[PDB]
């Protein structure tokens, strides 16, 4: 395996929890952000390149492409980071961080919000600014690519619009 920031947490701090590179698509992920408890001595492939090596995939939860995908339990693909941040979604196995399931428990309202970053409605499940009584909505990956503050912390997962970026 080959051991640039982890595209799930956007942190470059490598260490016991290394950043792996897919030997086919050059995806870079922490073994703990993507669910890789054992690293192979030879080539490592992400789940997308194991299954759909010559075809990119769509996220079931956002309109954006690229980054780190797992299969869902219902015939789709989703971003790890989208599954992490949407409250009703989860991972069936929390060590392997797969499959992504419970997408059917997302309230229809999330698909009716308008992402204020890409301005699209109905193309993914939005989350909202964690600020009380701020209703600004965004896709998880749109918040990531736009550089909004997004923190997971022992586990609370708080994301903020640019008005409400918290002290730090
Ligand atoms: Pr299920
Ligand atoms: Zn990471
Ligand atoms: Zn790959
Ligand atoms: Zn996504
Ligand atoms: Zn968006
Ligand atoms: Zn806000």
Curated annotation (Swiss-Prot):
A zinc finger (PHD-type) spans 4-52, 113-165. It is found in: Nucleus; Chromosome; Cytoplasm. Changing residue 99 to S: In IDDDFP; decreased histone H3-K23 acetylation; changed cytoplasmic localization; no effect on expression and assembly of the MOZ/MORF complex. High levels in testis. A zinc finger (C2HC pre-PHD-type) spans 56-89. Acetylated by KAT6A. Component of some HBO1 complex composed of KAT7/HBO1, MEAF6, ING5, and BRPF1. Component of the MOZ/MORF complex composed at least of ING5, KAT6A, KAT6B, MEAF6 and one of BRPF1, BRD1/BRPF2 and BRPF3. Interacts (via PHD-type zinc finger domains) with unmethylated histone H3 at 'Lys-4' (H3K4me0). Interacts with trimethylated 'Lys-36' of histone H3 (H3K36me3). Interacts with ING5; interaction directs BRPF1 to H4K4me3-enriched chromatin at the 5' of active genes. Interacts with KAT7. Scaffold subunit of various histone acetyltransferase (HAT) complexes, such as the MOZ/MORF and HBO1 complexes, which have a histone H3 acetyltransferase activity. Plays a key role in HBO1 complex by directing KAT7/HBO1 specificity towards histone H3 'Lys-14' acetylation (H3K14ac). Some HAT complexes preferentially mediate histone H3 'Lys-23' (H3K23ac) acetylation. Positively regulates the transcription of RUNX1 and RUNX2. It is linked to Intellectual developmental disorder with dysmorphic facies and ptosis: An autosomal dominant neurodevelopmental disorder characterized by delayed psychomotor development, intellectual disability, delayed language, and facial dysmorphisms, most notably ptosis. Additional features may include poor growth, hypotonia, and seizures. This is Peregrin. It comes from Homo sapiens (Human). The lineage of its organism: Eukaryota, Metazoa, Chordata, Craniata, Vertebrata.
